[PDB]
Design a protein around this ligand. Structure first.
Ligand code: CHL
Ligand code: CHL
Ligand code: CHL
Ligand code: CLA
Ligand code: CLA
Ligand code: CLA
Ligand code: CLA
Ligand SMILES: CCCCCCCCCCCCCCCCCC(=O)OC[C@H](CO[C@@H]1O[C@H](CO)[C@H](O)[C@H](O)[C@H]1O)OC(=O)CCCCCCCCCCCCCCCCC
Ligand SMILES: CC1=C[C@H](O)CC(C)(C)[C@H]1/C=C/C(C)=C/C=C/C(C)=C/C=C/C=C(C)/C=C/C=C(C)/C=C/C1=C(C)C[C@H](O)CC1(C)C
Ligand SMILES: CC1=C[C@H](O)CC(C)(C)[C@H]1/C=C/C(C)=C/C=C/C(C)=C/C=C/C=C(C)/C=C/C=C(C)/C=C/C1=C(C)C[C@H](O)CC1(C)C
Ligand SMILES: CC1=C(/C=C/C(C)=C/C=C/C(C)=C/C=C/C=C(C)/C=C/C=C(C)/C=C/C2=C(C)CCCC2(C)C)C(C)(C)CCC1
Lengths: 51, 236, 37, 217, 214, 67
């Protein structure tokens, strides 16, 4: 797993200019943290329940 | 046969409280519109846009973003976005789709729990573990290990739900018709279609509350649907 | 089945709420009476 | 017969003089205000509302104090305390209060919560009865109708007139009988249904005389 | 259309062309020209009689189905229709489909009380109109009573009405069979049918009860 | 100028498209405070159990609880 994460680190580093990361209203790099928190919290609760 | 002998005819739309008024956002066009939105969930949602915070270290002062302005987005606009088709979460048409989908499952579930308990004698809650330990239907052992069934259920339901999400018409997302209305009972705009849709949501809301009864009764009493019924009768 | 130790814990929670409410009530009363402009 | 100047009177033929303010136009008017308590028209209106509210409660109370006792001694159901003057004590038991003796009905355990819930619910209900609310707006403080007459038994005004009399008449009988329930309970610790059975068993020996009475001195 | 008019089929087959009552012309469904008695000569009685037939018909069709289902299902103990009412007096009471907890009815008086109150409202609404409908045909109200709009076409309604009466008359005749077969055989209609199916020459009315009927 | 486009990126784009969208005023802050107070009360209770400041009858709060 460490090797795969290392390879993904190189890719996500070289290809940093993804249209996913740009705010559609101003075309600037931004993150909708309130929504990202909800996404990454849902996974945490789902993974907590499964364990 | 004028009638008016065994009932008091009442003028006005039947609402959830004898003396109330419909919310401005509930006109009464949709089936089952009984004027019930006390929390105003379907009410048009107002929003304010905050400007992007300055986070450039090449600048002397990095102030926080202010209110670019207020905006009320138009709801009920389905888009090609697979992961979030609707423009707004809080929209009457989207909630209606959720109400029908939540409702149609509960109608199937309420009937299913009753039938399996009358056939196998096992509670609907207890049947979950029993089938997991031994896959079976109607007392017949199924020719499939639970592991394959688990992957199959996820894949089958995954494909089915992805097909359902392909529709872009908000009304057709709630009433697809076509292959799902082979008898052409409510594929028109007649009053029969309106009455049938009124019957569906009523049976749907009943099933949602009823299945909420099943799970709460199983938590408290411990028995299933038929079991709770028998326990109550004997409790006297 | 509630133990006397549990009753005091619940009472302390209630007492803590009354201390918080008595602080908030005093602050709101003075803030409303001695308002600015 | 029950309205107008020729209405029947509480003293029958011997009624003779009747209060001038106590004319017809109101249900249950038998020309009985010998105490002259409703001389003021404003007070008469208030007393009329008090009578019908005391009457409606009495009808509910009369039926409600007899049914659990009837069911218990008829074998229909087993209650914690069938007799009305003891049904309140059910909350002070091992199983709390179970409706119809079924542990899976209501199953109340805290008299406070019962008291708190009644205060909130009755307070709002009585407020709605005096200022309108979810059930309807106020037109007649004692005869709302509308949501309170869904069956439409009083749609015709002629039937509404005679029906109001039936309610006050049945109500008044309930008030007298419920007043009896209070006294019979104190004089006889037995429930009112038990008293009726005893009077039927031996009316000569089982009655307010040939028993108690002398004890009341 | 074959079921109406003067060319309609008649109860006496070929031997009915010269034997037709004047009042029976072919306007109403189920007209086979069978009015040998003087009944329904006056239109007022004929109109009244036509409704009673459809009512007795729709009732019989419900009765014919309901006198067989419980006897054909397990859990109900294959109870005979003429022996179903007594169950209310059993210790278990009336548990629908045999599933305990369903109705658990045990008071015959309570059942009759609700039936009288509900049926009186229902029958009253059917005669003087009511919430379901007002100003509609007495026997064919439709509307709330025709949700699937199966009879929207007048032509379809006419043929369907012929289907309703012919099925009803068969049910009425078979219900009369249930009454007599039970009073003679003492067994439920399904049991009587099964016995015939097994040994028809032995298990039939003539070879079993005809001799003791006098 | 629009950035690199990928099939996975266009799929996930709707989830990152409401950067500054807020509910006017205090929103559900009062509702949030209720859950915080409930969480604060819950944390106190479990703290008391471990600290033995609350002695529940069923819990033993020792290694004998393993048995
Ligand atoms: C024909 C003679 C006749 C007589 C003598 C009476 C006498 C009486 N009626 Mg009456 N009624 C009569 C005919 C009729 N009543 C009624 C209908 C009613 C009603 C609806 C009511 C009466 C009531 C009463 C009583 C009024 C209050 C009371 O207790 O007073 C006497 C005073 C006392 C008892 C005070 C305490 C004295 C004690 C000895 C100490 C009273 C004793 C009232 C009552 O009390 O009903 C039970 C009442 O509500 N009557 C009708 C039907 C139209 C009658 C005839 O047709
Ligand atoms: C068309 C309606 C109807 C019919 C035909 C019957 C028939 C019968 N019931 Mg019955 N019931 C009916 C309605 C009702 N029953 C009951 C409650 C009971 C109980 C509790 C019992 C019966 C029983 C019986 C049977 C008596 C024993 C026997 O073998 O008799 C055979 C006799 C016949 C076949 C001759 C009768 C045939 C005729 C066509 C009947 C016509 C009835 C009409 C309704 C006419 C009504 C006229 C007036 C009153 C309006 C019998 C077959 C008993 C039973 O099941 O025994 C085991 C029993 O214990 N019934 C209720 C209230 C819940 C009813 C409500 O509508
Ligand atoms: C308002 C409540 C109401 C209720 C609960 C019923 C209930 C019933 N109606 Mg009824 N009706 C009611 C109102 C009215 N009906 C009628 C006119 C009729 C007729 C003409 C008939 C019934 C019949 C029936 C019975 C058969 C069900 C049916 O119609 O299936 C049909 C629909 C879907 C399956 C049934 C128990 C039938 C009956 O008595 O069968 C023996 C029947 O033939 N009703 C009118 C006037 C138009 C009504 C007005 O309010
Ligand atoms: C929301 C719909 C729904 C869902 C999720 C289920 C789910 C389940 N049902 Mg069920 N069922 C349903 C509706 C549903 N049912 C309806 C509407 C009916 C009436 C026809 C039934 C009648 C029924 C019976 C008679 C039985 C089940 C059984 C089962 C269980 C395993 C058998 C199986 O499904 O294999 C796939 C079947 C092909 C399973 C948990 C079985 C069970 O409970 O195992 C003990 C069983 O015997 N169901
Ligand atoms: C004029 C027509 C007519 C009349 C007068 C009757 C009269 C009667 N029927 Mg009957 N029936 C009829 C038509 C008729 N039926 C028809 C056409 C059918 C075919 C569908 C049936 C099928 C039928 C059955 C299966 C049973 C009766 C029964 C009865 C008797 C008691 C009914 C009862 O319990 O209360 C009224 C009934 C109801 C109010 C129905 C309640 C709704 C049910 C219980 C819900 C559906 C089942 C439910 C999902 C079960 C949950 C668990 C399950 C999934 C395992 C009664 C004398 C019962 C009996 O024991 O006979 C003595 C009995 O079990 N009938
Ligand atoms: C003045 C009216 C009145 C009052 C104050 C009471 C008060 C009471 N009744 Mg009663 N009752 C009444 C009228 C009344 N009843 C009438 C008219 C009837 C005949 C239908 C009954 C039949 C009755 C029975 C069979 C029982 C009681 C019982 C009780 C006691 C339990 C209360 C409870 O939990 O109810 C329950 C609350 C509800 C059912 C909710 C009400 C429904 C709303 C609309 C929802 C309580 C002291 C029980 C008892 O303790 O036995 C002694 C008992 O089992 N009552
Ligand atoms: C003068 C001619 C005549 C005579 C002497 C009899 C005599 C008798 N008939 Mg009968 N019957 C007749 C004409 C006659 N019938 C005609 C013309 C018809 C056609 C309508 C019938 C239709 C008929 C039926 C349907 C039944 C009888 C029955 C009986 C017996 C009575 C059973 C009973 O009630 O006791 C005790 C009750 C029973 C034994 C249960 C039945 C009896 C011996 C009954 C029978 O056959 O008994 C077995 C019976 O069910 N008869
Ligand atoms: C459990 C309760 C949880 C509360 C979570 C925090 C709530 C407040 C966070 C934002 C504060 C704010 O408004 O902006 C930050 C605030 C307001 O900032 C600005 O102040 C200006 C002053 O002229 C104006 O009032 C502006 O309108 C205001 O936006 O800045 C401060 O007031 C500094 C001190 C903030 C201390 C906050 C303590 C809150 C404690 C309890 C609040 C309870 C209930 C609130 C309802
Ligand atoms: C006319 C005249 C004229 C001139 O003026 C003179 C004079 C004399 C003054 C007058 C008269 C008057 C009178 C007679 C009065 C009376 C009254 C009454 C008795 C009332 C009651 C009244 C009464 C009433 C209301 C009652 C009510 C009841 C109730 C609520 C009950 C409840 C209950 C129940 C159910 C059961 C349980 O377990 C218990 C309880 C819970 C408890
Ligand atoms: C046309 C003509 C002409 C010339 O002119 C003359 C003449 C010849 C006379 C005529 C004829 C006539 C006729 C034929 C008649 C018949 C009738 C009938 C049989 C009816 C039935 C009728 C019958 C009917 C309705 C039936 C009904 C039934 C029912 C509801 C049922 C019920 C039930 C059920 C389900 C089940 C259970 O367990 C039981 C009960 C509860 C019981
Ligand atoms: C001193 C000290 C400290 C610090 C510590 C640390 C921080 C350490 C580090 C650690 C680490 C951080 C380590 C690391 C490791 C890693 C590794 C060792 C890697 C591995 C990898 C490999 C082996 C390969 C893989 C691959 C690739 C790349 C690709 C694909 C294929 C494969 C998978 C093969 C502290 C704080 C404690 C304090 C005290 C003192």
């Amino acid at each position: 797993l460490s090797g795969l994460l290392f390879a993904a680190s190189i890719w996500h580093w070289v290809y940093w200019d993804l249209e996913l990361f740009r705010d559609p209203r101003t075309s600037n790099p931004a993150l909708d943290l309130p929504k990202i928190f909800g996404i990454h919290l849902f996974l945490s609760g789902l993974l907590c329940f499964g364990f | 046969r004028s009638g008016g002998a065994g009932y008091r005819q009442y003028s006005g739309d039947a609402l959830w409280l004898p003396n109330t008024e419909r919310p401005a956002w509930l006109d009464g066009s949709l089936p089952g519109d009984r004027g019930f939105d006390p929390l105003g969930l379907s009410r048009p949602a107002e929003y304010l846009q905050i400007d992007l915070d300055e986070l450039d270290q090449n600048a002397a002062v990095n102030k926080a973003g202010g209110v670019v302005g207020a905006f009320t987005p138009v709801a009920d606009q389905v888009s090609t976005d697979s992961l979030a088709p609707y423009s707004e979460v809080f929209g009457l048409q989207r909630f209606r789709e959720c109400e029908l989908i939540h409702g149609r499952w509960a109608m199937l579930a309420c009937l299913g729990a009753l039938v399996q308990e009358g056939v196998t004698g096992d509670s609907w809650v207890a049947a979950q573990t029993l089938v997991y330990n031994q896959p079976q239907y109607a007392g017949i052992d199924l020719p499939f290990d639970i592991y394959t069934l688990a992957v199959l259920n996820s894949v089958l339901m995954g494909g089915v739900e992805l097909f359902r999400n392909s529709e872009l018409d908000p009304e057709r997302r709630c009433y697809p018709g076509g292959a799902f209305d082979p008898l052409n009972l409510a594929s028109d705009d007649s009053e029969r279609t309106q009455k049938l849709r009124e019957a569906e949501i009523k049976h749907a809301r009943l099933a949602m509350v009823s299945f909420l009864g099943y799970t709460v009764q199983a938590w408290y009493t411990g028995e299933g649907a038929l079991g709770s019924l028998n326990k109550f009768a004997n409790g006297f | 089945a509630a133990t006397p130790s549990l009753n005091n814990l619940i009472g302390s929670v209630v007492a803590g709420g009354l201390v918080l409410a008595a602080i908030a009530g005093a602050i709101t009363a003075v803030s409303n009476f001695d308002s600015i402009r | 017969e029950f309205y107008g100047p020729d209405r029947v009177k509480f003293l029958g033929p011997f009624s003779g003089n009747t209060p001038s303010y106590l004319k017809g136009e109101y249900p249950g008017d038998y020309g009985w205000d010998t105490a002259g308590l409703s001389a003021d028209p404003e007070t008469f209106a208030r007393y009329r509302e008090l009578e019908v509210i005391h009457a409606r409660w009495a009808m509910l109370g009369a039926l409600g104090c007899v049914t659990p006792e009837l069911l218990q001694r008829n074998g229909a159901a087993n209650f914690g305390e069938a007799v009305w003057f003891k049904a309140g004590a059910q909350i002070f038991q091992e199983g709390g209060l179970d409706y119809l003796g079924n542990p899976n009905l209501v199953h109340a355990q805290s008299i406070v919560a019962i008291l708190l819930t009644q205060v909130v619910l009755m307070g709002l209900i009585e407020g709605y009865r005096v200022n309108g609310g979810p059930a309807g707006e106020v037109v007649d403080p004692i005869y709302p109708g509308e949501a309170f007459d869904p069956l439409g038994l009083a749609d015709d005004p002629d039937t509404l007139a005679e029906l109001k009399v039936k309610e006050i008449k049945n109500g008044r009988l309930a008030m007298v009988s419920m007043f009896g329930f209070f006294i019979q309970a104190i004089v006889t610790g037995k429930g009112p249904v038990q008293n009726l059975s005893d009077h039927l068993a031996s009316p000569s020996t089982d009655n307010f005389y040939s028993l108690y009475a002398k004890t009341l001195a | 259309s074959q079921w109406y008019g003067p060319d309609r089929p008649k109860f006496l087959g070929p031997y009915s062309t010269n034997f037709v009552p004047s009042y029976l012309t072919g306007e109403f469904p189920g007209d086979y020209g069978w009015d040998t008695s003087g009944l329904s000569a006056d239109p007022a009685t004929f109109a009244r009689y036509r409704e009673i037939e459809v009512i007795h018909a729709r009732w019989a069709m419900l009765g014919a189905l309901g006198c067989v289902v419980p006897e054909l299902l397990d859990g109900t103990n294959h109870i005979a229709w003429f022996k179903a009412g007594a169950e209310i007096f059993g210790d278990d009471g009336i548990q629908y489909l045999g599933i305990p907890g369903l109705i658990n009815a045990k008071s015959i008086v309570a059942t009759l009380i609700v039936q009288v109150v509900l049926m009186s409202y229902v029958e009253g609404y059917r005669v003087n109109g009511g919430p379901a409908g007002t100003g509609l045909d007495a026997v064919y109200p439709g509307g709330n009573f025709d949700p699937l709009g199966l009879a929207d076409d007048p032509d379809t309604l006419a043929e369907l009405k012929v289907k309703e009466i012919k099925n009803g008359r068969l049910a009425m005749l078979s219900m009369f069979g249930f009454f007599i077969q039970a009073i003679v055989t003492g067994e439920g209609p399904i049991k009587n049918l099964n016995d015939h199916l097994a040994d028809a020459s032995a298990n039939n009315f003539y070879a079993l009860y005809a001799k003791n009927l006098a | 100028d629009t950035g690199i486009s990928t099939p996975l990126g266009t799929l996930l784009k709707p989830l990152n498209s409401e950067y500054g969208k807020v509910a006017p005023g205090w929103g559900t802050t009062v509702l949030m405070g209720i859950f915080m107070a409930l969480f604060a009360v819950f944390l106190v209770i479990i703290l008391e159990i471990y600290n033995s400041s609350v002695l529940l009858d069923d819990v033993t709060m020792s290694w004998e609880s393993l048995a």
